[PDB]
Design a protein around this ligand. Structure first.
Ligand SMILES: *[C@@H]1O[C@H](CO)[C@@H](O[C@@H]2O[C@H](CO)[C@@H](O[C@@H]3O[C@H](CO)[C@@H](O)[C@H](O[C@H]4O[C@H](CO)[C@@H](O)[C@H](O)[C@@H]4O[C@@H]4O[C@H](CO)[C@@H](O)[C@H](O)[C@H]4NC(C)=O)[C@@H]3O)[C@H](O)[C@H]2NC(C)=O)[C@H](O)[C@H]1NC(C)=O
Ligand SMILES: *[C@@H]1O[C@H](CO)[C@@H](O[C@@H]2O[C@H](CO)[C@@H](O[C@@H]3O[C@H](CO)[C@@H](O)[C@H](O)[C@@H]3O)[C@H](O)[C@H]2NC(C)=O)[C@H](O)[C@H]1NC(C)=O
Ligand SMILES: *[C@@H]1O[C@H](CO)[C@@H](O[C@@H]2O[C@H](CO)[C@@H](O)[C@H](O)[C@H]2NC(C)=O)[C@H](O)[C@H]1NC(C)=O
Lengths: 72, 48
């Protein structure tokens, strides 16, 4: 899994992998990395139960639009 | 099951069980939140 803000995010379909510095989510039968965002994972529960959870961040697609929206 | 289709690929057992649960139509969070209960039930079953 993965912890961002106290909420554990799981992959909609695929697995989390890391090349050594960054984490990605990829389909199971073929290697093609994808940046992990809110469109790949769904929240459930909190960070205090899962075993082996990791501590990387998760992107949000809507943030840049707000900045432009505030700009104009 | 990858070793039945081709070369053998390693995978943690918890993740494998999550795959199976997804197979029978149950989200993964159930397994990742009840791991201990499932393990105890399995051990007791083999003992019986
Ligand atoms: C991922 O990265 C984030 C960075 O912020 C970490 O955030 C953590 O969030 C926790 C709150 O949910 C903080 O505390 C957590 O919950 C309990 C209360 O603190 C406790 O079980 C842990 O906190 C202790 O361990 C942390 C791990 O380093 C310490 O940072 C933290 O200061 C606590 O250390 C002592 O704990 C005892 C008991 O609570 C206290 O009596 C002491 O006073 C504490 N010492 C000091 C100097 O304060 C648990 O983390 C947590 O503080 C906060 N930061 C960290 C590093 O944990 C996530 O933990 C991190 N997750 C993973 C898997 O890396
Ligand atoms: C593992 O994946 C990470 C992805 O974050 C790789 O990060 C890599 O970081 C370097 C440095 O930025 C990138 O190279 C280039 O750097 C120049 C610096 O100016 C920049 O202008 C380029 O746009 C580019 O960022 C590299 O692209 C980037 N790679 C990826 C896939 O994002 C990291 O290198 C990977 N490590 C291994 C061992 O695979
Ligand atoms: C996954 O396996 C690794 C070992 O390869 C475990 O890491 C160590 O396990 C021993 C217990 O025998 C501990 O004494 C060490 O403190 C562990 N080292 C670290 C960095 O954790 C690891 O515990 C296993 N992962 C889980 C969730 O149990």
């Amino acid at each position: 899994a993965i912890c961002h803000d106290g909420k554990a995010h799981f992959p909609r379909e695929g697995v989390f992998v890391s090349n050594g510095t960054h984490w990605f989510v990829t389909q199971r039968n073929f290697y093609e990395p994808q940046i992990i965002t809110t469109d790949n994972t769904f929240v459930s529960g909190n960070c205090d139960v899962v075993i082996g959870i990791v501590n990387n961040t998760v992107y949000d697609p809507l943030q840049p639009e707000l900045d432009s929206f505030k700009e104009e | 099951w990858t070793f039945g289709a081709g070369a053998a690929l390693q995978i943690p057992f918890a993740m494998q069980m999550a795959y199976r649960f997804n197979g029978i139509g149950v989200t993964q969070n159930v397994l990742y939140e009840n791991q201990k209960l499932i393990a105890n039930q399995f051990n007791s079953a083999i003992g019986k």
